[PDB]
Design a protein around this ligand. Structure first.
Ligand code: NI
Length: 341
């Protein structure tokens, strides 16, 4: 049974609600992004209307085989009428194709559902500038002040400088980057660009990247592993055993691996600055955990909410424990008292 924080009142609509069977009263199912916790339940046998971005619709058709007649892509930043209700899709600054959804209810209420997002001051100059929001359905993944991490730009600067140094010292080093979902593609694209290489990967991952509308992608990636000195591997293989096993397969081309594991937040962010980050090393293998986040930091979240001044907030993450719920409610009241809304 579908929980309340996935239903949009006063509509026939649900958000990221595909794992509950046929939801009573649902005339259109929205999908904010192509991450498995959110699409859980979709397949080629789904027969209700799915509303989403163009890039999410390419993934639904090619990766999950949803039939074309049930896929309804909408452009971004454009007022659209769905089943008699005005909606707008906005870029979420999460993974490729990820959106927030603005719903303009028949009774005059305006609802924003953030999906998963990384808040940014640029969102203060989207179509959000123009009107009031009554209810905010908020991605609260990192809603606590202990959750600090650098800008994506600082993280990428570290990765490129680290990879370029290593390979210039040793032209026989291979660089490996872990992946398990879409998102964070700048990690492996920026490293391959500084090294003058395409990124090599499995047929299954190449297919996924081909659905993402990235400019000049055919110039940036390949399935010919022999031609590339940046390889992608499943995140589960990014360990000393997996990396040893990969280096064996490379036919004596390489004598060293430098690997990256993009994570979200980890508790080493409480102590160590990005610039001071060091790897774990065994022999000719070194692994860097880098804190590349596609969710808001606490401070980014706080800024966005204090600017938007919503009348009510409904969290969509960390909702399963009383302690998490109580913590989040306390921060929402602080933010409201501090800003005066
Ligand atoms: Ni996500």
């Amino acid at each position: 049974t579908c929980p309340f924080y996935k239903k949009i009142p006063g509509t026939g609509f649900t958000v990221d609600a595909f794992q509950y069977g046929v939801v009573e009263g649902c005339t259109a199912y929205f999908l904010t992004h192509f991450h498995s916790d959110h699409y859980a339940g979709l397949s080629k046998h789904f027969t209700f209307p799915v509303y989403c971005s163009e890039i999410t619709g390419n993934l639904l058709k090619n990766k999950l085989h949803v039939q074309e007649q049930y896929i309804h892509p909408l452009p971004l930043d454009t007022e659209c009428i769905v089943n008699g209700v005005k909606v707008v899709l906005l870029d979420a600054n999460h993974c490729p194709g990820a959106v927030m959804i603005l719903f303009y209810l028949p009774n005059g209420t305006v609802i924003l559902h953030t999906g998963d997002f990384r808040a940014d001051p640029s969102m203060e100059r989207s179509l959000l500038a123009d009107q009031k929001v009554h209810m905010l359905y908020l991605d609260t993944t990192y809603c606590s002040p202990e959750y600090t991490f650098p800008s994506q730009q600082e993280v990428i600067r570290f990765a490129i400088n680290t990879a370029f140094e290593a390979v210039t010292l040793n032209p026989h080093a291979l660089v490996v980057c872990g992946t398990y979902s879409i998102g964070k593609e700048k990690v492996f694209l920026a490293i391959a660009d500084v090294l003058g290489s395409k990124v090599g990967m499995s047929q299954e991952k190449y297919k996924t990247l081909q659905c993402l509308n990235i400019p000049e992608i055919n110039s940036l990636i390949t399935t010919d592993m022999c031609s590339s000195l940046v390889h992608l591997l499943p995140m589960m293989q990014i360990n000393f055993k997996g990396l040893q096993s990969h280096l064996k397969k490379c036919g004596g081309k390489y004598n060293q691996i430098l690997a990256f594991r993009p994570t979200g937040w980890t508790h080493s962010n409480k102590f160590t600055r990005i610039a001071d980050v060091i790897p774990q090393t065994k022999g000719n293998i070194s692994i860097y955990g880098i804190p590349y986040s596609e969710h808001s930091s606490y401070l980014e979240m706080k800024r966005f909410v204090q600017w938007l001044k919503p009348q009510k907030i409904i969290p969509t993450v960390n909702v399963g424990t009383w302690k998490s719920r109580s913590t989040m409610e306390k921060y929402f009241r602080e933010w409201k008292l501090e800003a005066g809304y």
